Structures are given as structure tokens and as C-alpha cells.
Amino acid sequence: RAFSPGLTGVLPLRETRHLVEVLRARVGDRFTVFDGEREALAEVVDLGPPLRYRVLEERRPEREVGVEVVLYVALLKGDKLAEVVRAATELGATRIQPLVTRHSVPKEMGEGKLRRLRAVALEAAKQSGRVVVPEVLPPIPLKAVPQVAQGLVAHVGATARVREVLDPEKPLALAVGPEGGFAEEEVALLEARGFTPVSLGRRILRAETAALALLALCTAGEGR
Ligand SMILES: C[S@@+](CC[C@H](N)C(=O)[O-])C[C@H]1O[C@@H](n2cnc3c(N)ncnc32)[C@H](O)[C@@H]1O
């Protein structure tokens, strides 16, 4: 795959070189090009440089992470979850699950909130390139959080880095605590669901910044 800003048929110097120089490209070879916004298949026309290609068929850029990415975040005060669902949507979350935690101020979510979150979601995906829209389900209790093939819980009291446990091939389950945070009993209770504690640095982070940090380290970090 090559990088061509705009898919105009003119591969920038760097791209032209590597393909012909290193990869050893010739006239006829069918490769793909993308500019980050769209993509398509091509057929090396002239080696230039710059190498001029022939777009054969417009492709649909891979936008999804690859595995299911569930975000279990505690109900936040105000419209915080609105900023979370947005960033999370553009970060790869394929499903967002609000959680009712001991210290989570709000204990429930009205159809109005669940409405705006879904609105924000279906918009964030649209504005991120994603065609898939993350599912924003009605809140539930921690106890409901099922067993997970893989789970990471942003825990201030942890020593494990995400890049030391993250298994790219297996689905992903994330968990962030409310403004107050997860209760010592809640945390371990999640670990009993398959959630491995993870640190997001040596500074206190808002539930929103925490969900973003965690998410970014499991997708944007791995370049997926
Ligand atoms: C802002 S914290 C609540 C206050 C925090 N327990 C404290 O006393 O420092 C809410 C959530 O943000 C996430 N978080 C914030 N800072 C974190 C950190 N340094 N490491 C891991 N998670 C963190 C966790 O999900 C935490 O439950």
C-alpha cells in the first residue's frame, strides 16, 4: 500500500522511490494507494519519477480496529459521557457500556441521554471515517460486566503497562471508574471477570481523559 494525498495519480517523491527503489516496482504492477480519507486499487503506469499509477477500483479503507472493542465506563456527571462516546467512537470502540458503580453519582440514564449519546456516536463515526456505529447501550451494574477474553481496567493503583498485556488478536474490554472511581471491591470484582489492572501514568486523570488514554493505547497506539 502506498501513500498518495488525494489519490490524484501522482505518488509523492518518497512513495515513488520506496516502491520502485526498494520494493522494485515495474509497469503493470497492481498496488493500492490512500491519502487517509479514501482509497483505491491501482496499476503502476510510468515509473517517473514520480511514479504515475492507474486507479483501477475505489476501495473502502479499513477503519475498524479488527476485534470487538467494548468500553465499560461508569456513569459520569453532566454530559461527560458525551465527550467520551465521541472520542471513543473515533478511537475504535465498537460498543460502549455505561456502568452504575458505587461512587458513580448518577445511578441511571434517561432515554434522553441515551438518545444524545447515540446521536454523538453515529456522528463521531461519520466524522472519523467509520461506517460502523458504536452501540451505546442503557446503563447496567458492574456485576453485569461478563467474562472477557481480554479486559483492561484503568486503575490508578496498578503497575502494569498496557503495551505489556495488550493482545491485539483477541477482543478488547476496557473499564474506567467514575469521578470518584472504582471501589477496592469493585476493581478486584472486575479482575474476576478477566480485567487486568493497567496504569495510565503517575497523575490523576479525569474519567474522560482516562477512557481516551486507555482507548488510544489499544488502537491509535497500535496504528489500527
Ligand atoms: C479520576 S479517577 C477518581 C480519583 C482517583 N481514584 C484518585 O483518587 O486519584 C476516575 C477514573 O479515571 C481513571 N484513572 C485516572 N487516573 C488514572 C491513572 N493514573 N491510572 C489508571 N487509571 C486512571 C480510572 O478509571 C479511575 O477510576
Instruction: Report the CATH number at residue 52.
Output: 2.40.240.20
CA of 72 to the centre of ligand 1 (A): 14
- The answer to whether 37 and 171 have CB atoms below 8 angstroms apart is no
Q: Are residues 48 and 107 in the same domain?
A: no
Deposited experimental method: X-ray
Q: Are residues 41 and 148 in the same domain?
A: no
Q: Are residues 42 and 72 in the same domain?
A: no
Domain boundary among 29, 45, 62: 62
Place of cell 501514568: 201
3-state secondary structure of 207: helix
From 75, 153, 196, 204, the mutation candidate for ligand 1 (largest count of ligand atoms within 8 A of CB) is: 204
Q: Are residues 29 and 123 in the same domain?
A: no
Cα(4)–Cα(15) distance, integer angstroms? 8
Q: Are residues 190 and 117 in the same domain?
A: yes
Burial category of 157 from C-beta neighbours within 10 Å (exposed 0-12, middle 13-18, buried 19 and up): exposed
Residue 154 beta carbon below 6 angstroms from any ligand 1 atom: yes
* Domain tally, the chain: 2
Residue from 191, 151, 146 nearest 167 by CA: 151
Q: Are residues 21 and 84 in the same domain?
A: no
Q: Is the dihedral of CA 117, 123, 126, 131 positive or negative?
A: positive
Cα(11)–Cα(3) distance, integer angstroms? 7
Q: Are residues 178 and 90 in the same domain?
A: yes
Domain extent, residue 47, equals 1-62
Report whether 160 belongs to an annotated binding site. Answer: no
Q: Is the dihedral of CA 164, 170, 176, 182 positive or negative?
A: negative
Instruction: Please state, in angstroms and as integers, the Cα–Cα distance from residue 191 to each residue in 92, 131, 132, 196, 204, following that order.
Output: 23, 33, 29, 6, 21
Instruction: Please state, in angstroms and as integers, the Cα–Cα distance from residue 67 to each residue in 4, 92, 168, following that order.
Output: 28, 9, 8
What is the 8-class DSSP label of residue 12?
-
Cα(99)–Cα(104) distance, integer angstroms? 8
Secondary structure element (H or E) that encloses residue 81, with its range: helix 80-91
Instruction: Please state, in angstroms and as integers, the Cα–Cα distance from residue 90 to each residue in 99, 156, 215, following that order.
Output: 21, 25, 10
Instruction: Please state, in angstroms and as integers, the Cα–Cα distance from residue 189 to each residue in 24, 53, 144, 160, 192, following that order.
Output: 55, 56, 11, 18, 5
Q: Are residues 69 and 175 in the same domain?
A: yes
Q: Are residues 15 and 48 in the same domain?
A: yes
Q: Are residues 156 and 207 in the same domain?
A: yes
Residue 109 beta carbon below 6 angstroms from any ligand 1 atom: no
Q: Are residues 3 and 105 in the same domain?
A: no
Report whether 177 belongs to an annotated binding site. Answer: yes
